[PDB]
Amino acid sequence: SGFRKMAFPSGKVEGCMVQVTCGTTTLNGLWLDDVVYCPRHVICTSEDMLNPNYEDLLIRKSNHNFLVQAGNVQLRVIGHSMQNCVLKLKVDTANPKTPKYKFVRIQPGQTFSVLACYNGSPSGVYQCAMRPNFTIKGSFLNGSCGSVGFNIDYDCVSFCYMHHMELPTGVHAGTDLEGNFYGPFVDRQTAQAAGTDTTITVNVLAWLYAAVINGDRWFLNRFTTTLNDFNLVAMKYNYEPLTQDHVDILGPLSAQTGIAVLDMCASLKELLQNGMNGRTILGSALLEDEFTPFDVVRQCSGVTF
Amino acid sequence: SGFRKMAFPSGKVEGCMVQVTCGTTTLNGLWLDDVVYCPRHVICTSEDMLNPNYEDLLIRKSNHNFLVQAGNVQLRVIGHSMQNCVLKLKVDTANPKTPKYKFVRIQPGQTFSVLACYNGSPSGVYQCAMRPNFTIKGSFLNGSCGSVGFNIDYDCVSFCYMHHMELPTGVHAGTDLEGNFYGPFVDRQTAQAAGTDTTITVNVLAWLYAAVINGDRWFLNRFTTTLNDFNLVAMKYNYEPLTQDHVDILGPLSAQTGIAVLDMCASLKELLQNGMNGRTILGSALLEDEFTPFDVVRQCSGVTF
Ligand SMILES: O=C1N[C@]2(CCc3ccccc32)C(=O)N1c1cncc(F)c1
Numbered sequence: 001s002g003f004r005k006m007a008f009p010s011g012k013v014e015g016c017m018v019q020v021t022c023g024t025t026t027l028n029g030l031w032l033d034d035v036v037y038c039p040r041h042v043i044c045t046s047e048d049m050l051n052p053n054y055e056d057l058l059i060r061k062s063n064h065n066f067l068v069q070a071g072n073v074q075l076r077v078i079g080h081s082m083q084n085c086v087l088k089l090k091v092d093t094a095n096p097k098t099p100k101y102k103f104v105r106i107q108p109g110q111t112f113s114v115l116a117c118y119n120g121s122p123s124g125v126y127q128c129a130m131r132p133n134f135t136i137k138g139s140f141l142n143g144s145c146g147s148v149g150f151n152i153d154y155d156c157v158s159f160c161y162m163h164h165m166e167l168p169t170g171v172h173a174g175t176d177l178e179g180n181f182y183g184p185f186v187d188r189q190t191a192q193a194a195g196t197d198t199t200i201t202v203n204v205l206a207w208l209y210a211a212v213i214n215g216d217r218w219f220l221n222r223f224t225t226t227l228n229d230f231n232l233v234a235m236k237y238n239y240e241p242l243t244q245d246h247v248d249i250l251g252p253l254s255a256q257t258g259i260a261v262l263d264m265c266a267s268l269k270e271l272l273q274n275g276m277n278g279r280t281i282l283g284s285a286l287l288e289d290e291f292t293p294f295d296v297v298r299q300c301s302g303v304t305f
Numbered sequence: 306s307g308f309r310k311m312a313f314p315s316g317k318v319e320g321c322m323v324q325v326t327c328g329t330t331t332l333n334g335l336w337l338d339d340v341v342y343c344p345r346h347v348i349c350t351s352e353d354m355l356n357p358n359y360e361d362l363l364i365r366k367s368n369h370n371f372l373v374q375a376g377n378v379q380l381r382v383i384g385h386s387m388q389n390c391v392l393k394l395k396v397d398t399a400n401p402k403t404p405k406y407k408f409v410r411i412q413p414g415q416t417f418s419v420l421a422c423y424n425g426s427p428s429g430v431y432q433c434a435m436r437p438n439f440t441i442k443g444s445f446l447n448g449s450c451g452s453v454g455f456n457i458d459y460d461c462v463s464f465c466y467m468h469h470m471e472l473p474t475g476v477h478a479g480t481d482l483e484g485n486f487y488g489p490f491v492d493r494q495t496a497q498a499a500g501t502d503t504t505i506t507v508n509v510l511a512w513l514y515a516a517v518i519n520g521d522r523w524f525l526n527r528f529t530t531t532l533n534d535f536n537l538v539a540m541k542y543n544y545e546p547l548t549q550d551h552v553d554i555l556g557p558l559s560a561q562t563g564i565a566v567l568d569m570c571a572s573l574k575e576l577l578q579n580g581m582n583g584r585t586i587l588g589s590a591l592l593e594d595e596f597t598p599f600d601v602v603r604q605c606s607g608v609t610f
C-alpha cells in the first residue's frame with residue numbers, strides 16, 4: 001500500500017536524448033531511428049525571438065550547421081526539415097537504443113512523465129498533467145527545451161510532449177512530436193494568454209478512490225448527489241463538468257471499492273463546500289487532480305513495463 | 306522555473322533489476338557485477354513469517370534452488386551467503402549493465418529515489434525521504450520487496466535502500482545494501498513500534514527558499530527570530546531542532562536569495578503558529594519536508610548525470 005505521484009521509469013527515453021547546437025544555441029533533441037527531433041527555436045538568436053521568421057532563418061542553415069552529439073558520439077546530419085514548430089534532422093545512423101515507440105497527441109487532463117534534460121543529459125523525472133488550458137506546471141530551466149514527456153504501455157513509449165517555452169506567468173508550453181503546440185501558444189517571446197484553467201474533476205474523484213483503497217476514509221459521508229446537482233457545485237468551484245463518460249471511466253474503481261460514483265461525488269461536494277478542516281488525504285492538504293483513473297488502477301495493481 | 310518533486314533518472318538502476326524466486330516466493334533482486342542482492346525473506350513461506358529462523362531456512366537451500374532471471378536470461382548461481390537481512394547470490398556472469406556504484410547508509414532526513422519493481426520489472430520511480438524515525442512513506446505492493454532506493458552523482462549510483470516490509474500502520478521499512486535495517490525493525494510479521502516521528506526542519510526551510518526563488522513570496526514577513534526561540538516553536542510543533550550545522554547547509558540558498566536563515570525561520574514560525582490561511586506554496590497547502598537543501602540547489606541549477 002501507499003500512494004505516490006509516480007513517474008514511468010525513464011531508461012528507454014534516456015537512451016534517446018541528444019544535444020543539438022545551431023550557432024550559439026544548445027538544447028535537447030530526441031533521436032529515434034535515424035531522425036533527431038528538436039524545437040525549431042534552436043535556429044534563433046536573441047535578436048530573433050520577439051517574432052522570428054523561421055522559414056528565412058532555416059534557409060540560412062545547412063546540414064553541417066546542426067551539431068548533434070549523443071553523449072560523446074557525434075552524429076552526421078544528412079538532411080533537415082521543419083514540421084510545424086519542430087525540426088527533423090535526418091542522421092546517417094539509426095539510434096541502437098531506439099525503443100518501440102509511437103507519437104500521440106494527448107487530451108487535456110491526461111498525465112505523462114517528463115524527463116528533464118540539459119545539454120542532452122538527463123537531470124530528473126517527474127509526473128504531471130496536461131492542464132485543461134493546455135499548459136503544464138513543470139520544472140524547466142534555460143536549456144531544458146527539447147525535453148520530452150511520455151507514457152509507457154508494455155514495451156512501447158508513447159511520446160506526447162516536447163518542451164518549448166516558459167510563459168511570462170511561469171507556466172510551461174510545448175508541442176506534440178509533430179510540432180503542433182498544445183493550446184493557443186506560439187514560439188515567440190511575447191506575452192500570451194493561457195485563458196481559464198479548471199480543476200480536472202474525474203482525476204480528483206480517482207484520487208479519492210485511491211485514498212479509500214489506502215484507508216484514508218474520513219471524508220466519506222452519508223450523502224449522495226446527482227450528476228446535475230454535482231455539476232452546479234463543480235461550476236461554482238471552477239471544476240470541469242462531470243460527464244457520463246467520466247462516470248464510466250471510474251467504473252473499475254467504483255466496483256473495487258463498492259462506493260458508487262455519485263456517492264463519491266457527494267463526498268467531493270462536501271469537501272468543496274466545507275474544505276478539509278485542517279486534515280489531509282494521502283499526504284495532501286488540497287484536492288489532487290494529477291492522477292487519472294488509469295494511473296490509480298495501475299499503481300494500485302502494480303503494472304510493470 | 307517551477308519546482309517539482311523530481312526523481313533521479315532510473316535507467317542505470319533499471320538495468321540491474323532481476324527476479325529472484327526461491328520455492329513459491331518471487332521478489333526483486335539487484336545484479337551488480339557478479340552478485341545479486343535481495344531480501345533474505347525470499348526463503349520463507351507463510352508458516353515461517355511470524356518468527357523465521359533464517360539460519361535454519363537457508364541451510365535447507367542450495368545454489369540451484371535460487372532462480373534468478375534478468376528479463377528473459379537465466380543466471381547461473383555459483384554461491385550464496387546471508388549478510389544481515391540480505392542474501393548475496395554469486396552468479397557466473399558479471400552484469401554488462403553494471404553502472405559505477407557505491408553502497409551508502411543514509412542519514413534520517415535525506416532523500417532518495419525509489420524504483421518500484423514487481424517480478425524484476427520496473428513499474429515507476431518516485432522521490433522520498435528517510436523519516437526521522439527511519440521509516441519511509443512509499444508506494445509498495447506485495448511483490449515489491451527488493452526494490453531499491455538510490456541517488457546519483459555524476460555517473461555514480463549510490464544505493465542506499467532495499468525494501469523489505471510494510472508495517473501494520475501502512476508505512477515502509479527496509480535495509481541498507483549490507484542488509485542492516487534502518488530503524489528498530491526486524492524482518493518478521495509482528496507489530497513493531499516506529500516511535501515518534503518529526504518534521505524535517507532543515508528541509509522545510511530549503512523548500513521555502515525554493516518557493517522564494519520561484520516567486521511564491523507571500524509568507525515572507527517583517528520579523529526575525531533566534532535559533533533558541535525558533536527551537537522552542539519547533540518543539541511545540543514536533544519539528545526537528547535546528548542546529549548551526551543546518552544553518553550552515555542552508556548558506557548557499559541564503560546567499561542566493563539574500564534572506565538570512567533566521568529571517569526565514571521567522572517566516573516558518575509564523576506559518577507554524579498561524580497556518581497557511583487557505584493559501585498555497587509551490588502548489589502545496591502544507592509545509593513540505595521532502596526536499597533537502599542539496600535537492601533545492603540541484604533542481605534550481607539544472608545539474609545532470
Ligand atoms: O530557453 C528558453 N527560451 C525561451 C525564452 C522566451 C522564448 C520564446 C519562444 C521560445 C523559447 C523561448 C523560453 O521560454 N525558454 C525557457 C523554457 N523553459 C524554461 C525556461 F526557464 C526558459
Ligand SMILES: O=C1N[C@]2(CCc3ccccc32)C(=O)N1c1cncc(F)c1
Pocket residue numbers: 001346354445446447448449450469470471472491492493494495
Ligand atoms: O511482501 C511482503 N511480505 C511481508 C508480509 C509481512 C512481512 C514480514 C516480514 C517481511 C516481509 C513481510 C510484507 O510486509 N510485504 C510487503 C511489503 N511492502 C508492501 C506490501 F504491500 C507488502
